[PDB]
Each structure stands twice: as C-alpha cells, then as structure tokens.
C-alpha cells in the first residue's frame, strides 16, 4: 500500500503541476517514468521544476498562512545534493544570508535529500535556524520559555549558553547514521536583530527588548506528490503581531505587557482601563516602527489582511478552491477590523502542503 | 414522526431536568403524564419548573456566549397566559423596566406561548426589544444600517421615524390570526441609554456617541423538551467590546473609528501606525468608563473571559460536558491575552437552547 500511496500522490500531484506550468502534453509520458522508477527503485526523484512548483503549491496551500498572495516568487534552494554535515551547516548558514538579504528579506526554502524508507539523511532539530535559547531552574526564568527543551538537548550535548535573555540558539541537526547530532554556534554577522524602540515614547529603550529579523521554520515536513521532505527549512519576513502580540506578550513567552505598561505610564491594576490592550497596541507600534527604522522587512496585520484578500481574489479568478484556518489566519490584535474575521474559511487539507512531524528530542 | 419528535425530546429533558433538580424518582411518573398528554392533546406543557430550569439549561448550553458562569441566576418571567396584544406590549414593557433595575441589570426571560402546529402564538419582528432605526436613500446613511430592513417594515405600517442617528424603533409583533403586525413607541423613561465620554480626553463628547443600556434579544427561538417557545426575549447586561469593538467601531455599524481617531489626536493614514487598534481600545476605554459612571451594568473582556474559565471549571466539577463556539468566544479585542484563545471547544448543539429562526418581514 506504501508504494501505491506514493503512485497514488504522484499521479495526483504531476497532473496539477504540469496542468499549472502548460506542460498539459508531457504527463503521459512523466507519469510512465516515474511509474517504471517506482517499480525498479522505491521511489521517485522531482525534476528541479517540479520540485520548485511544488515547494510554492505548498505555501499556496498552507491554510494557517495570511501571507500567502506572494506563493508564486518563492526562491526555492535545491540542495537534495547535499551528503556532509558541513553541507548541511554551509547550506543552512547560506539560506539565512540569502533570505535575510541585508534586511530586504526574501521569501526562500532551501530542500535538502527527502527520507527514504521513512529514513531521514538530515534530521534538523532546531524549530526555527534562529531562535532565542530558555533556561528555568530554581524559580529563575531566562529568554524563552518556548526553546526550553531544546536547549537543555544542546547543553546535553556540551553547548553552553551564556544565559542572557536573547542568547541564540546553535544549529542543531543529525546525519543519517550518526548516532548524535552534531551543533554549530550561529556566525553573529550573518544574524540581523532589531532593537524595539518606540517612535513617541523615548523610555521604551529601557526594556532593552530585540528580535532577530527572519523567522525561518525548520521543523516542518515538505510533502511533494507523495515525496517527504521532513528536512525543507523556509522563511518569509514578520507580521508585526507575531512579535509584539505573541513572542514579547504572551505569559508564557517572555511576558512583557506590565513592564511595557509601565515605560508608557499607565497604571496595570484595573481590567477596565484595558491596560493590557493599550499596552499591546504600543508595543506593537514599536515592532513595526523598529523594524522599518532599521531596513529590515516586516508587515502589519492591515496591509497583510489586505494582500490576504487580494490572494482570495487571485484564488477564484484562477478557477483554484481557497482552503484556510480562520483560527489561524485572524491577527490577535483587532481581529475584527480585518475582512478575515467577517467571512468563514474552508480548513481541509491540500496537498503539496507543510505538515508538523514529531520532535527527535525529549 | 413529527409527535414521535416531541416524545424523545421530553424524554431527554425531564430525566436532564429532574437529574438536576434532585427530582429523579418522579420521572418515570412525570413522563406518563406527558406520553398521554402527547397523545391526547398533540403536544404537552411544562411545569413552571421545568420551564424555569430549561431556560437555565439553554443559557448554560449557548455556544457562543461568554457570560455562562451565571446561568443559574437567570429571572424567568412565565407569560404563557398571555392572549391579547395589548398583555404582549405590557409584557415587553414589564422586561425592560424589570431587566434595566436603574441600571443594575438583572439576566431576564419573558417566556410568551410556545408554537402549537408550527403556528406561532406571538410573533416578535424586533431583533432587540431596545434598537436603533437605519435609513439608506440617495447616498446619505443614518442611524444603524443593521435595523434597515426592519425600519422600512415599521414604516410601511405608519410609523415615522425622525431620523436621528439614534431612533428608538418601535416594538413591533403579530399576534396569531392578525394579518398585520402592530407597532408600540417605547416609553422613553423605560430605556437607559449612556452617552460615550473618555477618562481622559475632553474632546471624545464631540463624537456625541450613546448606546442603550440592556441587550435584549427577541428574535431566537427557546427549545425546551421538544416545545417551541418562537417569542421569548432575554437579556443580559453588555460586553464592552460589544459595543466599542463592533457596534459603534464596524464599517457596516456606526463605523466610527477615523472620527475616534482625530478626536484622541492621532493621524489615521497609515496602517503602520495601528491608529485603528489604537482607535478600537481609546473607544473601549471609553465605553467602559461611561457604562461604569451611569451606573449602568457592564463587563469588560478580561473580566468576562476570567468568569468564564470559572464556568468551565464549575462543568467540570459538576461532570457536565463544555461545549463552545471558539470563533464567537473569543472577544474582538486582544484576544490572545484570554485564556480562551490558547484551547479548543467542542461546538456540539446541546439542547435546551437558543436557535435562530426566519425574519417574518424582508
Ligand atoms: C512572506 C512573508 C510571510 C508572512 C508575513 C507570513 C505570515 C504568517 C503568519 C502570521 C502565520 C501564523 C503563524 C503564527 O501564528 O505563529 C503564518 C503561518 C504559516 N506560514 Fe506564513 N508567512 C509568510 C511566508 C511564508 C512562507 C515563505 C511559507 C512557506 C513556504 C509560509 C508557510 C506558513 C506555514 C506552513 C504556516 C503555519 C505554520 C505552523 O502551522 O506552525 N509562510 N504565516
Ligand atoms: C449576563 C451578561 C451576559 C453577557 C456579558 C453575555 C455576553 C455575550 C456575548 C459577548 C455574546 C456574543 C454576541 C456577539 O458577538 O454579538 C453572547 C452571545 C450570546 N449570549 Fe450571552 N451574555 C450574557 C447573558 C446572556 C443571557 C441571559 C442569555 C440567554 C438566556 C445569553 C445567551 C446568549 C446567546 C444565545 C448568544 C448567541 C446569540 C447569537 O447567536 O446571535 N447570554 N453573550
Ligand atoms: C515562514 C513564516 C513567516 C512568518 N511571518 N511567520 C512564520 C511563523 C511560523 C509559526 C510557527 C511557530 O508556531 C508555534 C508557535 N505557535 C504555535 C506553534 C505551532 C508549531 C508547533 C510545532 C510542534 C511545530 C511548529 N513548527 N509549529 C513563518
Ligand atoms: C443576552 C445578550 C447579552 C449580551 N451581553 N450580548 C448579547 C448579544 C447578542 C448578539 C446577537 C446579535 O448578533 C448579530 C450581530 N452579530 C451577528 C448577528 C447574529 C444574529 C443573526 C440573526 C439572524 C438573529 C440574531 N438574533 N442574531 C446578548
Ligand atoms: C461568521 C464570521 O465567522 C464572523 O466574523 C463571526 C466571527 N466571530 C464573532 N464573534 C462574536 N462574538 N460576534 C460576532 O458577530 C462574530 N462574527
Ligand atoms: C490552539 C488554539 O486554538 C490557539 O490559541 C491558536 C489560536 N489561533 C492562533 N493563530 C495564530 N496565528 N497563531 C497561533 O499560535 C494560534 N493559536
Ligand atoms: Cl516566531
Ligand atoms: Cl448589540
């Protein structure tokens, strides 16, 4: 059955992709190949166009995304060639200079060698290529919380980090063979970070609060026409609530919202005087002003909302089912002031698609 | 079928019912009764018991309401004896001075007859016992384009509204066997409205905003052990964002966030700066404060969301399942900083409960 879900998906996929690239004519004859190579091999290998396409139908697909009007320029990596963890380090330390691109981000996924048997050739640990480390111990909390685990994986295995609230994780990954993975200290050249500073409120520096510039996924599984890619790690540039209403805000990240209450001087003692949502609302603006003060891309959830539309319409004038996570795709500041909060979603499952896989720590 | 309808939802209430009012050993006798009722009759009717605590299991049941934790203090109100139209407006009226208290709400049901064949007994064309009027002609908005509809049915019957941004509508009903609804003016010294001042900013007056003090739903049907009750109006007090987040702040509403914008002094041309969620929370504040200085009954979100935890809490304890519309949960403004954002509910219909039903104009 393994081997006809894989026949199944190619079938499925290889149709829609060559239907999509005018290549209608050519899939007879691909789908006999890949037929005959499945037969003989095990499995199939993506032309490097194929391949491309499917990494943008799987963004185009991912229904928890609000970002999605730009699937079609995707800058696709192909590194299925890749056979050394020195590669693997190379490519991941290339894929976060390209993508940040001095600040003017470009969207990008860097595909490394797919599993085989379900046998992955490059198992990546980190859940994004950067990420704060978070340490608790003795009532002490440091950085974030969210990276606990993780961090206590690579202090397993003799990384030390320095403790402060923002120190950056390694690279950490395992090679097919190998029993423990191997880790690489981030080049801090190569890492951009804003400083929150707020256009208005001069205090706001003494919170002394920074984010790195590219959130770059590294822990989902690429699925192409039955082919998984569990190794396919991706970037796109911020949405501002993702940083000051999630990552800087929530309890149980690094909790915030009374210091900021504070630095723009309102009291944080009364549910009725919305504190907490003056407070959001200001370290938000600060995001966004940051980001942009110091060159380095980033959307607010207006003007996203509004390129989300735009990709609803391309949608529909393209004859395409839209399929989306209307839990997901609402901005957590001022839902309702976005045409997503009005209308509902179809949330099914399309594929090429990104899919969450089991952690191989803790 | 339609009988055999009836009998199974008797019989999941009463046992429910009477479980729950540590009535159980009077069930099987309870459901002889009603089975021969059903028989004879065609239908049966509830004890002022029954009622009472099927209406407090149908708030309990309601999805998609915040303020749950304080269903079993709902004030049922039985008006099944009610036969003539002149009983109904005075029932209506008795609702709103009752619900309103000077300002202290209490949680209240009227409960009219139930629908015999399907046939209505009463039929409410209010969406709230308390609502403004909206107008629509030659590109000139007023009042509250929601009540459009209904505000050109009242007027097809005689009366005029006068076209303020805040006409009271008329309470209008058809009683079973009228062709035509009648219409009643709501006595003014019956409804409390509150006009919207800020804490802070003087100026926030200008904007000349008010909204009513007690929501009144009139348009939902009350299911309980198979009996249609088509017209029984309930109340409970506001949710701030109610009002600020979507009444007063909605573009198809009042849609007052550019003018809240320039009278807290802050530019509203890019999305960048978030003037509008910094509109949205200004408004808040305001709404809340105004309520609170009128003594007039009203919640914020915080509170709300931290009373409903408590509800979920008291379900548990109690050993009753929680179901939950999440989409409608959470509030409109931060709401990823309620707990109610960061879990999942299950949003199976539980009846007793409140439905929708088909508008009798339009
Ligand atoms: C170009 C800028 C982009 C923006 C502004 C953007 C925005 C977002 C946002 C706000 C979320 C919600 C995540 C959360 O709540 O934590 C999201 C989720 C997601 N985005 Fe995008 N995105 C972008 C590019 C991309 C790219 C390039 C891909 C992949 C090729 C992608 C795939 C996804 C996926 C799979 C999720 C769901 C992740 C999960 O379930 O954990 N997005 N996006
Ligand atoms: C005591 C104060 C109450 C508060 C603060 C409250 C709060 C809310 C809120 C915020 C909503 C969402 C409505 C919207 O988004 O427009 C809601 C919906 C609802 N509430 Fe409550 N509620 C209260 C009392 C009641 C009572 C007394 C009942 C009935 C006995 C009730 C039944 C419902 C129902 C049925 C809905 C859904 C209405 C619909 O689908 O249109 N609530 N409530
Ligand atoms: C490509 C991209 C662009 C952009 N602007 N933003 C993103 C954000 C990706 C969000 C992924 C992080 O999600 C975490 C934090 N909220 C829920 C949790 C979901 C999750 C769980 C697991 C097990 C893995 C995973 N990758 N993601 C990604
Ligand atoms: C009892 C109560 C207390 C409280 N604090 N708040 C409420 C609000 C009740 C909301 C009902 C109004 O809902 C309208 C506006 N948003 C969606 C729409 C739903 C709707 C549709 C229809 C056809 C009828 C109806 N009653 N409700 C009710
Ligand atoms: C139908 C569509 O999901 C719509 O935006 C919903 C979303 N959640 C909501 N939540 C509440 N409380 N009230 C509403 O009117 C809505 N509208
Ligand atoms: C699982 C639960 O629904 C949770 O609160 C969801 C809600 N919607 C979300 N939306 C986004 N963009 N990101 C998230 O992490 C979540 N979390
Ligand atoms: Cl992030
Ligand atoms: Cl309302």
Redesign the interface.
């Known amino acids: 059955e393994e081997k006809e879900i894989l026949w199944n998906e190619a079938k499925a996929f290889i149709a829609a992709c060559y239907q999509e690239l005018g290549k209608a004519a050519e899939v007879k004859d691909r789908l006999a190949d890949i037929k005959s190579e499945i037969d003989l091999t095990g499995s199939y290998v993506h032309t490097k166009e194929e391949l491309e396409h499917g990494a943008k139908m799987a963004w185009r697909n991912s229904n928890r995304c609000i970002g999605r009007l730009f699937w079609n320029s995707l800058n696709v990596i192909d590194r299925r060639d890749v056979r050394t963890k020195e590669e693997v380090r190379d490519a991941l330390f290339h894929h976060i200079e390209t993508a940040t691109n001095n600040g003017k981000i470009r969207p990008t996924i860097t595909i490394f060698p797919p599993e085989e048997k379900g046998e992955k050739q490059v198992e990546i640990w980190n859940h994004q290529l950067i990420r704060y480390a978070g340490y608790e111990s003795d009532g002490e909390r440091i950085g974030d919380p969210a990276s606990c685990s993780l961090t206590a994986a690579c202090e397993e295995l003799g990384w030390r980090g320095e403790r402060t609230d923002f120190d950056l994780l390694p690279l950490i990954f395992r090679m097919k063979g190998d029993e423990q993975p191997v880790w690489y200290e981030l080049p801090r050249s190569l890492v951009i970070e804003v400083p929150i500073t707020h256009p208005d409120i001069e205090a706001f520096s003494d919170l002394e609060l920074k984010w790195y510039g590219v959130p770059i996924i590294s822990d989902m599984k690429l699925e192409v026409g039955g082919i998984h890619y569990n190794a396919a790690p991706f970037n796109g540039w911020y949405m501002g609530t993702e940083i000051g209403?999630?990552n800087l805000?929530?309890e149980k990240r690094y909790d915030k919202?009374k210091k900021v209450a504070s630095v723009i001087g309102i009291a944080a003692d009364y549910?009725?005087?919305?504190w907490?949502?003056?407070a959001?609302?200001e370290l938000?603006?600060a995001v966004?002003?940051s980001y942009?003060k110091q060159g380095v891309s980033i959307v607010?959830h207006?003007?996203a909302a509004?390129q989300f539309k735009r990709f609803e319409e391309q949608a529909e004038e393209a004859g395409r089912k839209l399929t989306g996570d209307?839990?997901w795709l609402?901005p957590?500041?001022?839902?309702?002031?976005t045409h997503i909060?009005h209308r509902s979603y179809d949330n099914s499952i399309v594929k090429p698609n990104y899919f969450y896989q089991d952690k191989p720590y803790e």
Do not use: C
């Not at 549910?271 to 919305?274: A, C, G, I, V």
């Not at 957590?332 to 002031?337: G, L, Q, R, Y």
């Open positions: 209403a999630r805000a929530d919202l549910n009725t005087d919305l907490k949502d003056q959001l609302v938000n603006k966004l002003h942009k607010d207006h003007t509004s209307w839990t609402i957590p500041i001022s839902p309702a002031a909060f």
